[model samples]
Target: MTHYKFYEANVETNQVLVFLHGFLSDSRTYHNHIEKFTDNYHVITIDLPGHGEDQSSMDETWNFDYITTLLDRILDKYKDKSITLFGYSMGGRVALYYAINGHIPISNLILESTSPGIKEEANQLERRLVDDARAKVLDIAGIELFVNDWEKLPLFQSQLELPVEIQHQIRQQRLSQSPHKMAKALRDYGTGQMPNLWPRLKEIKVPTLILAGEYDEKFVQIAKKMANLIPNSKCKLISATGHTIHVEDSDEFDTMILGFLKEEQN
Candidate 1:
């Protein structure tokens, strides 16, 4: 089963909020944000396979389909409550797949900095090669150097401007991951491996919210495209932030989430 934890609110509510973190991060990604919703909504944070406390070694062919089965088992217990799934980046991809394919009843879906997969067939192999090369680097140079190099990635350039404490916290999360496990994650669960979910977005019948950082041009375009494809979806861009919107601006993130949840309630 997937590694997960629940934070029940003091109030009597029938809503369950679930969080899935990005690659190179763990359940701790939304620590502060989770605390914000604990007053009214029961919150659950999950660590993806090979991440955080999940030490399970997956087979070579294990994919999102397999992971969601595990997710279904954990979430099935909360079937009596309304469940809202919120995911970021890699985890967002997983949540998207689960929303479309899993057995659990999902009431609402929220994706941040997510992609529907590589839309092109020819480019899939190219991405696999790139991720394989990245995995090889982790295997050879170890996690410290790999993390230092990762910090310089163009996608995370905006994260450099964050407060020192926040940056260190993010760094520690990345550094705590096992190099081999992360390499396996990249090899097996990378965007290249996930089926082109762009065509499947319309299958998600629940209310969906697509979010992207204004500074992350790539995901912004993708989010717009996703919003267009999803039947009951709305897209928004958070200004002055990059890929990791929650970490970059929790206040705005919390407001957007709470506002959306509130509007949906009515």
Candidate 2:
């Protein structure tokens, strides 16, 4: 069974909003969104397997199928209820998978800083090899040591404008992860492991919103491309932010999402 940590609030609300965090993070990444959305929607946040407090189980080879299956079961428990899927980065990819595969009854979809997997098979293979090697290092070095190297990635360096306290909190959150779980997650779910979903964009019929940080040029480019490809999709760019737009500009991020939800309902 897949192990995960989840938080649910406003269960009585007619609308269900599910939030998925990015790589290395967990459901807690959506704490702000929960507080902001609970009044209007039944908000649910889940930690990806091997992250946060749900690190007890590990898949021998981690991939989107494992995570998507876990999500499918969770949605199945809701049965008749339709949900709005919101995902950040890695979670975003999973959300897309769930929607494309018609696995979950998603009323609406939101993808933040996510892509439709890598464009080339050769690049994917190269990434898988590199990630597997990194996973080995993580298994040996542990969480703390691995975190030091993780924060140095270029994707994170752009977030230096955030308050020192906020930065420290984010760092602590990542450090709390289990090194083994982290490694396995990377090895299994890295970009290479994902199937290219570009051709399948037309299959996503649900109302979709794509958000990308203005500073994350790569994701912004991808979001723009997705907007053009997905028939029923809108794209938004959050200013003065990097990859972690929700953390760097919580107010704006919350407003954008809430607005999208309201629009979808209308």
Candidate 3:
């Protein structure tokens, strides 16, 4: 039983945000505002199993249950604080699962570019196979080879608009991850491997904010659908942004994030 890797800042604040990053990324992905946002909200970020600092922990499985349990352990340290869950992409999927399970008490939930996973079993298996194939890259070559094609995927072309330094920073975050853990995440926690939460979205009573990049067509549609099913949720697109909202336009992302969660809640 090793200590779960986490980063906590601005501990004095009553309210805090627990940020869960996407696959192949770590808590440091929030470098955009870890320091800047700490004044208003204590910032707590975690590395999901096999990612970043969590690579050393005994996290052999990367399924939904294991990942959520890992999150629960890290969250236990901040149990006394008012917690708001913030997740992006893969992190968002885990966040939604955690919330829908009715296990944690969070002030609010913010999901960006997240999915509820494939609802069909066959489709789920198909996705798992794809993830397995992708993971095989790490076995054959290395993380750099896999990350190179990852940054060039059509879904991330808009990232080209970002400054070279920012792109390098993002790339480095992916490079920092261990290929084994990432592949474990892909095989065990991939969207297809996750339970389809679309049928259970109505169970979420917490006020939730669903965000997507205006240009990210797939996630935009997903956001709209999720908002329709979640009674206390609203979906909005960040104008001119794409898949990586926080990276491409974190300024706007934080504005909407703070405006929604910082406002008075019942």
Candidate 4:
């Protein structure tokens, strides 16, 4: 806690907003987000384990509970303040877990291209095995090869059409992390191992915004079901977009977010 470094703006505000980036990316991934929202609310963006500035701080156990424990404690500084949480992909899962664990004085919840968790016990085992194999091969496969393989997954095929510089930037972020941290992150926090929050969504009493790329059918379905499950939640599908909505469609993404977060205000 003493050595941890993070990027924060507008700390003097009574209201705060925390941004959590997706896997293989860091706070830098949300540069535009900070630029866009800082004027309205104090924006804080921090790198998760195996990503960005926190890459070197990961220990052997990087499970969801452990990671959220650290976060809950760190964010306790704002327990006396009202806050909002915005998470994308993996970070969405983290934010969801954080809010579900406790109300946290959170005023809003925004999740992009995310899910509650694997809902079935049998499928969880299969997914765990798959992630275990990936974890075992992580160092042996090397970050470059592993990232290349990851990008090849159908979910990211749309990214190939993205500008060359954008792709390069994303790759560099992924390349910066150590294999040990990445492996532990996956082994511990992967969807298969996390408790399915489907049954618990109704328990999340905060107003929530669920954003999904129209082309991301899987998560769209997840978002739909999540919206139905969470009493105070609504879903917004980004037209002509896929996974990684913030990266692929910044304009629409920013608008949707800013609109939602500022909806309660004048």
Candidate 5:
């Protein structure tokens, strides 16, 4: 089973919010959000295979299919509750895969800074090459060195503006990952290897919210496109933020998601 932690509400509730964190992040990444929601909804955070406290072997191949199967088993344990699936970055992609392909029922779907895989074969191959190269670097340089370079990527440029303490916390989380697990994750779970789900968005029947940071122009465009394609979806952008909106502006992120969940549940 996937490693998961639950935060129960003071007042018993049938609503359950499940969180899936981004790349290099574990269940602890959503610690604050979990605390915030615990007064109303039971919250569950999962450490995806190869991330956090998962004892799974580093040699295990990580992919959406495998991850979703594990998630199905975990979620089944809470089948009685109304499940709201929230995912960020890489985890967002996994959450989406489960919602679309897995048998479990989902009441609402929330995606942040994520996209369906490449639409064309050539582009997919190109992206695979990039991820493979990244995997090679992780294998050679190890976690600390790789994380140092990872944080420098332009994708995370806005994160540099965060307070030094928060930045340190983020760095520490990234550094704790095992190089082998991370490399395998990149090799098998990267967007390039994920199915192109753009065409299938309309098939989604649940309420869906697609969020992106205004500063992250790439994902903003992707979110808009996704919103357009999804039958019952809305897209929102968090101003002055970049890829990691939850980390960049936790209060706003929590507020927006909480409001959405409240309104949707009612």
Candidate 6:
């Protein structure tokens, strides 16, 4: 068995909205929007392999094909339903892979704070090394210590802007993750392991929405570039937010997605 656990809500809706979270996090990260989206769509929030409830045995060289296969199984379980794919960061990368490889029949695609894999060989190699080191830290220090360092990193400074309770909740969620699995994900799915999809963006025929936080300048630039590359894509930068735009501004994020889906029907 895959050992993945899915949180389902609003089973009455005809449409299915599947959420894919970023690295080091689980489906619980999406609880806020998942709850609100259930009003109209059946929300399926999943813990990626080696992340939340899906921490089963994994090979050392698990790749995109491995992750996509897992997603394929999940989609198969709900094969008859229409699916809207929502991915953030690492999840966005997985979503792109699934769409490009024709693994899932995506009605629409939404990518938040994501990017094509690193383009330079040297930079990619450097990232592999750094992520591998972080994996070792996770293995040795465990979740609590790893999360402390994770929060201190510049990437998460914006998280401090969230309410204290929310911040603590996120921390607790992170701490619940298995260090070994977290390390495996970094080793297996890090930028170094990802294939570059820039050249193939034009081939993604599904209507796509690419969102980035205005404060996350790196991904903002990436979203603009993806918009230009993808033939059927629209890009938006959510102001006053950083990498975690969904968490930072859930109401705006929810409205934007619902509006996009509504427009697609017109």
Relative to the true structure, how large is the alpha-carbon lDDT of every model?
0.90, 0.82, 0.82, 0.80, 0.88, 0.83
What pairs collide in candidate 5? none
- From the highest TM-score down, the ranking of the candidates is 5, 1, 6, 2, 4, 3
Give the best candidate by lDDT.
Answer: 1
Worst-scoring 10-residue span by lDDT in model 4: 1-10
TM values, all candidates: 0.97, 0.93, 0.92, 0.93, 0.97, 0.93
Q: What is the C-alpha lDDT profile of model 1 across 34-110, one tens digit per residue? A: 77898888999989888988856666455887788778988999988889999999999999999989898899999
Candidate 5 residues lying further than 4 Å off, grouped into runs, are none
Off by over 4 Å in 6: 1-13
- Candidate 6 lDDT, 194-242, residue by residue in tens: 8888887888888899999988888999999999988889898999999
Model 4's alpha-carbon lDDT is: 0.80
- Model 4 lDDT at residue 217: 88
Backbone N/Cα/C clashes per model: 0, 1, 0, 0, 0, 0
For model 5, how does the per-residue alpha-carbon lDDT over 131-176 read when each residue is reduced to its tens digit?
A: 8998898888899988988999999999999999989989989999
Model 4 alpha-carbon miss at residue 65, Å? 1.8
Residue 124 error, candidate 3, Å: 1.8
In model 1, what are the clashing residue pairs, if there are any?
none
Candidate 3 stretches with Cα past 4 Å from truth are: 1-12, 56-59
Candidate number that wins on TM-score, 3 or 5: 5
Question: How far off is residue 98 in model 3, in Å?
Answer: 0.6
| Model 4, position 34: C-alpha lDDT score | 72
In candidate 3 the C-alpha lDDT for residue 37 amounts to 69
